[PDB]
Design a protein around this ligand. Structure first.
Ligand SMILES: Cc1ncnc2c1ncn2[C@@H]1O[C@H](/C=C/CNC(=O)c2cc(-c3ccc(F)cc3)cc(O)c2O)C[C@H]1O
Ligand SMILES: [Cl-]
Ligand SMILES: [Cl-]
Ligand SMILES: [Cl-]
Ligand SMILES: [Mg+2]
Length: 213
């Protein structure tokens, strides 16, 4: 088995079904005590929670589910009727994420799309009946943040006021994306300093609010 499967099993052996907080705590405990993994973690997760509560988005897109930790984090704070779409290229991770959400009781709020973001993004309008996104959480391969931001715009999926929230803008970093949004008159940017998941290493989230063309 894989580390990802081991995290899911620990949740199944240690958390309460239908209790998102107990799922998050179990993941954090496993990744602190047993094996590190690239979940967004509790430090940055608390910032994410405060941003999601502030904006109360009706439709969120996540790029890069991994094991579903961030999807559980976000979905548990969505207002009734609001929804999350999460894209995950690795079929094993897509299935783990679906199972994590099922365990947490959040499955009716989330759609887990198994595929590459650059292939799925152009299908959101026609196949998934999306108009525009209220929020986008970027947490996939770091060289894809900028290409996918540009693709989202091309596809008409951003509106004035869409909130981009990007993980890992310090470590590993996403230098092209970060320079681009910070230099662009089409984004208003704010940096939230924090810590790499499960580590005493500085990281941060970037909030980049789209201003329109
Ligand atoms: C194109 C595309 N479409 C859909 N899913 C995609 C995708 N590219 C990746 N994915 C999925 O996102 C996930 C991957 C994300 C990449 N994230 C990382 O590489 C990552 C790495 C670190 C890190 C920090 C310090 C260190 F010393 C070592 C590592 C920390 C993090 O928080 C991360 O998100 C899983 C993958 O299948
Ligand atoms: Cl995560
Ligand atoms: Cl790819
Ligand atoms: Cl943490
Ligand atoms: Mg990350």
């Amino acid at each position: 088995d894989t580390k990802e499967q081991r995290i899911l099993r620990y949740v199944q052996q240690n958390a309460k079904p239908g209790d998102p907080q107990s799922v998050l705590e179990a993941i954090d405990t496993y990744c602190t005590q047993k094996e590190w993994a690239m979940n967004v973690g509790d430090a940055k997760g608390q910032i994410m929670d405060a941003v999601i509560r502030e904006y109360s988005p009706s439709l969120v897109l996540e790029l890069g589910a991994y094991c579903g930790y961030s999807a559980v984090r976000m979905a548990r704070l969505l207002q009734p009727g609001a929804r999350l779409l999460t894209m995950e290229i690795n079929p094993d991770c897509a299935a783990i994420t679906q199972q994590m959400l099922n365990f947490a009781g959040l499955q009716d709020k989330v759609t887990i799309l198994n595929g590459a973001s650059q292939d799925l993004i152009p299908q959101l309008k026609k196949k998934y009946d999306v108009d525009t996104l209220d929020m986008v959480f970027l947490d996939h391969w770091k060289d894809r943040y900028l290409p996918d931001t540009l693709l989202l715009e091309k596809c008409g999926l951003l509106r004035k006021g869409t909130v981009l929230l990007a993980d890992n803008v310090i470590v590993p970093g996403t230098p092209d994306f970060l320079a681009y949004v910070r230099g662009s008159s089409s984004f208003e940017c704010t940096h939230y300093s924090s810590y790499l998941e499960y580590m005493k290493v500085v990281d941060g989230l970037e909030k980049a609010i789209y201003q329109g063309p």
